[PDB]
Amino acid sequence: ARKACADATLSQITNNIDPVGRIQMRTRRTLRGHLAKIYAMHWGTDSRLLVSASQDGKLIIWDSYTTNKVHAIPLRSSWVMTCAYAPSGNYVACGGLDNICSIYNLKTREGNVRVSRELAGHTGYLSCCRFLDDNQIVTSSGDTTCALWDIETGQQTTTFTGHTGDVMSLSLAPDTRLFVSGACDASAKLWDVREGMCRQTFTGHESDINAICFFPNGNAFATGSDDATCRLFDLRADQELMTYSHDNIICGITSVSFSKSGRLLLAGYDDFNCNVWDALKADRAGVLAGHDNRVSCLGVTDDGMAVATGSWDSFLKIWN
Amino acid sequence: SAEDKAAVERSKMIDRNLREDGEKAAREVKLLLLGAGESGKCTIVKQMKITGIVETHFTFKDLHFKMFDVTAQRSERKKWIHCFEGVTAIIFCVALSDYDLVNRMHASMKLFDSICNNKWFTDTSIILFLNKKDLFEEKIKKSPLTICYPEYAGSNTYEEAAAYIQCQFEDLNKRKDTKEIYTHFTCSTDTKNVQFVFDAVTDVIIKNNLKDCGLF
Amino acid sequence: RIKVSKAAADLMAYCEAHAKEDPLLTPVPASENPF
Amino acid sequence: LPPLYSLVFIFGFVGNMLVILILINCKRLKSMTDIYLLNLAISDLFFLLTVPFWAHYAFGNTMCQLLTGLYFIGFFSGIFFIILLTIDRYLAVVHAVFALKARTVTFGVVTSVITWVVAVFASLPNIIFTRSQKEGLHYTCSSHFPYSQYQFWKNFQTLKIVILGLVLPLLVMVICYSGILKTLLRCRNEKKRHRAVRLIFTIMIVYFLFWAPYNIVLLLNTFQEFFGLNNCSSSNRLDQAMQVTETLGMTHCCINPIIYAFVGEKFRNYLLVFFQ
């Protein structure tokens, strides 16, 4: 249909760009306070506090600068697979298999964290949650449906439908007017937070998509699937751009994150370590390892000061 | 250094109470319930003792038990079965009467073979329960078992028909030396069914401790 | 539906503008680095 | 015989350290039985560091009193730890539900310090009666007791070194493993039990092939009334009998990791991860 717009490949345009090079990134500090496997992790807007969810029933907020635990929210359900951190920093979200997006208020009397609101209405297991703002939150569930939520009422403000498979992850654009989600049918949908429509459909993968992240300008995004390929898509041309595939790697991708500049791409693989990709050259520029188990989380701060990776070995590391 | 000392001090309190908070998980036994249809999580939960997943807490012989039922989860199991990796044991509930209805027993092993040979369930044993035994005899007297499997269970006698089905569930795994499979015929008594669970999990605790004790 | 070249040109221009103020691809001094 | 001392430190020294270097980074002491083997690793080196200094390798009375102690506290700590591991193994299998609440680190460290302080308490009578006969040798230090109480201290030191040496551990070795085997034959896995039951018999016999020869020659050396004093000819032959048993007792300290740690199925999994 839109193959007429495919005039040239980005690699041919980016062939003249100087490569990033084999950058070496080391672990400045390791966060080892959890007990069970880590499945969720989010970065704060202040680039100071990060929250991680483990299977022990504990929601721990970590102080990245001082390596300390600011909070430890006792989860009602020990099974959690997603978490979020509010842009204001007052609330923290957590999902799981209980179909409940528990939100806790950090700013309370005597420093006692309490459940701000109980969210229900998803028949499938929750897979991803993202805070649009202090008043709204987008949640991805295993019932092939994602919906927008309101805090003080808890009702279904806007429900996004059109996914054939269950959604695994989603990310929010910097302007927060649009967001995309990746399901298990090797497809990605663009949803408007105000209208809840399906402007265009992104696809091209050969397996289930498990990672979603926008480009820092908001005009593009990348997907991470289990077909051992990372695919970057743009909201304007709506095509496949610069697939990140290597013959050495055959394992899937579980987390994809973008640096603040967007020049290099962070991709989390289940081969017991994480990988760093060049977002314009599709070259494996720098490889970081050290996780005892497979990595499950990957996020970059707003200012790009540091990047954190969450693995199943109950260890959190910060890379610079 | 007043502000930084208080942050570390309150973080030390966070690390202190998680030492026993996570220790209670070690004492507690995590049990996972599987089932082809509505037959899962109906037998043991019927005992009178104490949204997506319903968990039952009950202490037997001074041992805490936590049973997790995933019947309400209608999503693809390949996305969330790895979340349950590391449980103490897996409890499988299948109705012996579910062979003359549309074929359900063929789907039961299809669910059973996926969970038993799963890559994340290598060290976790499975305690399968052959339910509906009270009316299984009447059902096989009404209609032969040959309609389910072309290889008949002997000569259509209850003594060997139930013994044939249990073996057909215990030979699907190739990892027989890696983990053991416990089979029990549920009866019309809550104290008899929970007793087998306690003994089966006890053996799992014995097996699991041996790797830490170095015997294995 | 703009051409891929026009969309690719926007991506490289955004990366080039923010390349100097990028702590990952350009390392920062240890004292300035909070970690 | 000089090469025999080097063979002990060839793999026993760094092998003991490799156990410590793999439990900190990888194991992180998540299991409670992990701390019973790290202090066991400290104890055997405390016995190992005495071997080079026992051969008069090169400070008259102070240093060897620490060297004599480092032998005994190093010896009593390791021999008391393996008793705790068998008690740990006993409670783990014969009382499955009772151990789950008993197997905790907060109880593991408090019972490891008390067995550390009973070793120095049972050893301090040796440090009190430790002086150097020859200062020129600088490594020949023996136990000297008053003539009035020479028979009391010589008998008491011997009475406690043997009962705490063999019969108290071996009595724990048999009453615990008998209950272990009684709670192991029903594991419905004949292939895996064959190697499990075979290895647990090795743990008992090697204890009777490395420490028993030290004790067999010890009672005869202490109780001269039976054979030693009457013969008076084997005393020259028995002069080196203690030295060859000490090495035979020292080599038991460097085989602890291969019999308590390197025999666990999951333990080699961390070895290749540590090698990277």
Residue numbers in the entry:
A (entry chain B): 21 to 340
B (entry chain A): 6 to 55, 182 to 233, 241 to 354
C (entry chain C): 27 to 61
D (entry chain R): 33 to 90, 96 to 313
Study text:
The chemokine receptor CCR5 plays a vital role in immune surveillance and inflammation. CCR5 exerts its physiological functions by binding to multiple chemokines, such as macrophage inflammatory protein (MIP-1α, also known as CCL3) and RANTES (regulated on activation normal T cell expressed and secreted, also known as CCL5). Here we report three cryo-electron microscopy structures of Gi1 protein-coupled CCR5 in a ligand-free state and in complex with the chemokine MIP-1α or RANTES, as well as the crystal structure of MIP-1α-bound CCR5.
The data showed a wild-type level of basal and chemokine-induced activities for the engineered receptor. The ligand-free CCR5–Gi1 structure was determined by cryo-EM single-particle analysis with an overall resolution of 2.8 Å. Our ligand-free CCR5–Gi1 structure provides molecular details about how a CKR activates the G protein in the absence of an agonist. Lacking interaction with the chemokine, the ligand-free CCR5–Gi1 structure exhibits a more open ligand-binding pocket compared with the chemokine-bound CCR5 structures due to the outward shift of helix I, the second extracellular loop (ECL2), and the third extracellular loop (ECL3). Close inspection of the structure revealed conformational rearrangements of the aromatic residues at the bottom of the ligand-binding cavity. Compared to the structures of the chemokine–CCR5–Gi1 complexes and inactive CCR5, side chain of the conserved CKR residue W862.60 rotates toward helix VII by approximate 90° in the apo structure, occupying a similar position to the binding site of the residue 3 in the chemokines. The movement of W862.60, together with an inward shift of helix II, further pushes the residue Y1083.32 toward helix VI. To form a hydrogen bond with the side chain of Y1083.32, the residue Y2516.51 undergoes a downward shift (relative to that in the inactive CCR5 structure), placing its side chain in a conformation similar to that in the chemokine–CCR5–Gi1 complexes. This rearrangement results in the conformational change of W2486.48 and subsequent rearrangement on the receptor intracellular side, leading to receptor activation. Nevertheless, this does not rule out the possibility that the specific conformations of these key residues on the extracellular side are stabilized by and/or resulted from the G protein coupling. The mutant W862.60F displayed a basal activity that is 70% of the wild-type response, while the alanine replacement further reduced the activity to 50%, supporting the critical role of this residue in inducing receptor constitutive activation by altering the interactions within the aromatic residue cluster through the conformational change of its bulky side chain.
